[PDB]
Subunit: 360 residues, 2 copies
C-alpha cells in the first residue's frame, strides 16, 4: 500500500467510527450526523496532509529496519495513520477557531468554515471544539491497550497547550507588553521595540513549531516504540529550527505570493503582525525608513499597505532571506548529523522532513 | 479545615503552579502572566463552586467511613479539590465560548469576558481554549502517579465531548432537522414539531447533565478509589434526572426571574430556544394559543416577547412545574434508595446534591 492511500483510507474508517458512535451512544439524528460529516470533511481535508504523513513516514522508516510480524507492521502503520489524523484534526481545530478570531475570509481558496451560510460563528466555535474532542476520542478508542497511550496523550496535551500559548503570543504581538490589560482596549505599539528576532522566534516556536514538526516526529517515534533510539533534546532543537523556517516562508508569502496562488488575501501588514519581514526590515532600515514604516503599518488603507510593501521591496529582504536560509541549512544539517549517532533511520526521516520544507 | 476554605486555597496553589510553569517552561513574560491570572480569576471565580465542591463532598463522605493515615486523608482531599477545579475550569471554558457564540452581554452581573475592553473576541476564543488546556495540565501534574489517572482522563474526555455535542443540540434546537445544511442559512422552524419532551431531554442531558452532575459525582468516586462501591448505571440515571431538573429551573428563571437577580437579561424567547416553558406550553395549548405562540416566538421585538410571556403566564405552567417536580422527587428518592444497596455513604452524598439543587 502507498502511504497516502493508506492514510486516506484510515480517514474513512475514523470518520465512520466517530459518526457511528454518535448514533449509537450520543443519540444523534441523521441530519446532525450529516452536518458533522460535512464539517469534518470541509475542515480536515484538502490540504497536503504534511503533518499527519510525517507520522506515517517516521514509522515506515523504522519498519524498514526492525523485525516484526506482518500483522505488527500493519498495526504500527494503522496507529501512525490514526496518530497523523489526530494531528490533522488538531490543526483543523486551530484553523477553524483562528479564522473566526482573525475575521479571515478564505482558506485554501474556499470560504472559512464559519462563513458558510448554514454554519455561522455560533456553530463554528463549537464545531472547532468538537474537532479537538475527536482527537481524544480517536486516541482512547484506537490506542486503549497500547503501551504508548499515556506518553502520546501527555505529549499531545503539552503541544496543544503550547500552541494556544503561541496563539496568545501571536495575537498580542503588536501591543506593548507593559500595556496589556483586560480592562483597557489595546493600542497598537508605536515604537515597535518588541519587533525583535528573539520575540519573533518565541511567537513562531509556540504557535507553529510544536504542532507542525515536534508532534509529528515524536508521535512517529511513540507509535514505533522507538523514543529510546533518539536524543529527545536534538529532536526538539531540529523541530524548532525547521518550524521557524517554515513560518518565515509563510510570512514572506503572506506579503508577496499572489492571492489566487496563496489561497488567501494575506493581511499581515494590516493586522500589524510581528512577521519575519517586519522584524528583518526593522533590523536594517535607516531612521527615515523606520519613520515611514511606523506611519503606514497596521492600517487597513491600501495606500499605506502598498507603502509598506514598497519599503520591503526596496530594503532587499531577499539578501537577508538567503542569509537566514544558508544558516538554517548549516544548522539543520549539523542536527541531522548529531541524530545519526543514535539513529540513522530517524536522521533520514528528519532529512526528508527538511527537504520537503526547504523545497515547497 | 472547612471544605470551602480548602477548595479556595487549592485554587491559589493551582494558579501559582500554572503561572510559574508558564514562566519557567513557556517563556512567558510578566505582563502576559498577569493577563492570564486576571483571565483565570475572572472566568473561574465568583460562582457558587457547586460542581467542584460536589467532588470534595463525595470524597469527604468516603473519608468518614474508610480507614486511612492522616497524610492519605489530606492527599485524597487535595486530589478532590484539584479534580473539582478541573471541572470549574471546564465550565469556565464553556461559558467563555458560549457567551461569545450567543452574543451574550452579562454573566453573574458582570460583562462577559469577551466584552472586556482589553480582551475582545480575538483573544477571548483563545482564552477559552487555554481554560480547557489548563484542566489537562492540572491532571497530568497533580495525578501523574495516581492509579485513577487514566479513568479520570478518559471520563473527563467523554464528558467534555458529550457537552460539546449538547451545545450543538442546543444551538440547533430551533431549526428543522431535515433542513440542517452547512450550505444553506438556517430558518427558524415554523411548525415547532421538534419541541417535544424527548427532544428537550436530549438537549439538556448532553449540554448540562454530564458536566454538572455526572462528572463531579464520578470524579469524587475516582479520587476516593470507590467506583466499585456503586452501581454506575444508577449513578448515571440519577445524575441525568437531577441535571434535567436543574435545567428546567434555569429555563423558568430565564423567563421570570428579574434580570438584576438573574445576573443576566434572559433571551431564550428571542433566541427561539427549545426551553422547558416552550415545550410544556406546546404540550397544553389550544389551536389559537399555538398560532399566537408561532407568530411571536423567536423575535427580538419586545412586544412579541411580552406576548410570549403573557401566553406562558395564562397557561398556568406552575401546575405543570409542580407536577414535574413531584415526579422528579419520586424518582430521585427511588434512585437514592437503590444506591443504598451498595453504598449508603454515596447515597447520602447524592441526597445532599439533590437537596442543594431542589432548594436553591
Ligand atoms: Mg491568527
Ligand atoms: Mg501567515
Ligand atoms: Mg448557549
Ligand atoms: Mg438558561
Amino acid at each position: 500500500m502507498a502511504s497516502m492511500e493508506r492514510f486516506l483510507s484510515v480517514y474513512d474508517e475514523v470518520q465512520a467510527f466517530l459518526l457511528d458512535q454518535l448514533q449509537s451512544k450520543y443519540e444523534i439524528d441523521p441530519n446532525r450526523a450529516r452536518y458533522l460529516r460535512i464539517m469534518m470533511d470541509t475542515t480536515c481535508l484538502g490540504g497536503k496532509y504534511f503533518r499527519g504523513m510525517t507520522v506515517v513516514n517516521v514509522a515506515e522508516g523504522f519498519l524498514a529496519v526492525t523485525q516484526h510480524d506482518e500483522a505488527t507492521k500493519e498495526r504500527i502503520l494503522h496507529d501512525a495513520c490514526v496518530g497523523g489524523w489526530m494531528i490533522e484534526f488538531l490543526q483543523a481545530h486551530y484553523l477553524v477557531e483562528d479564522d473566526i478570531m482573525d475575521g479571515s475570509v478564505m482558506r485554501r481558496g474556499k470560504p472559512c468554515w464559519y462563513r458558510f451560510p448554514g454554519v455561522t460563528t455560533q456553530c463554528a466555535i463549537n464545531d472547532g471544539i468538537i474537532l479537538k474532542s475527536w482527537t481524544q476520542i480517536m486516541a482512547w478508542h484506537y490506542f486503549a491497550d497500547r503501551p504508548f497511550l499515556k506518553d502520546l496523550l501527555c505529549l499531545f496535551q503539552k503541544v496543544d497547550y503550547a500552541t494556544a500559548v503561541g496563539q496568545m503570543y501571536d495575537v498580542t504581538s503588536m501591543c506593548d507588553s507593559n500595556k496589556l490589560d483586560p480592562e483597557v482596549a489595546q493600542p497598537m505599539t508605536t515604537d515597535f521595540a518588541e519587533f525583535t528576532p528573539a520575540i519573533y522566534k518565541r511567537i513562531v516556536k509556540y504557535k507553529t513549531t510544536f504542532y507542525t514538526y515536534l508532534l509529528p516526529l515524536v508521535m512517529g517515534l511513540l507509535v514505533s516504540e522507538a523514543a529510546a533510539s533518539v536524543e529527545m533534546n536534538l529532536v526538539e532543537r531540529v523541530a524548532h529550527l525547521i518550524g521557524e523556517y517554515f513560518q518565515v516562508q509563510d510570512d514572506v508569502m503572506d506579503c508577496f505570493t499572489p492571492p489566487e496562488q496563496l489561497g488567501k488575501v494575506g493581511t499581515d501588514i494590516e493586522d500589524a503582525k510581528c512577521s519575519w519581514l517586519a522584524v528583518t526590515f526593522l533590523g536594517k532600515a535607516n531612521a527615515a525608513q523606520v519613520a515611514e514604516f511606523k506611519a503606514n503599518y497596521g492600517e487597513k488603507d491600501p495606500a499605506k499597505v502598498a507603502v509598506v510593501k514598497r519599503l520591503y521591496s526596496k530594503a532587499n529582504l531577499q539578501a537577508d532571506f538567503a542569509a537566514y536560509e544558508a544558516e538554517v541549512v548549516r544548522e539543520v544539517e549539523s542536527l541531522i548529523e548529531q541524530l545519526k549517532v543514535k539513529s540513522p533511520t530517524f536522521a533520514e526521516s528528519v532529512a526528508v522532513v527538511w527537504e520537503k520544507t526547504h523545497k515547497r
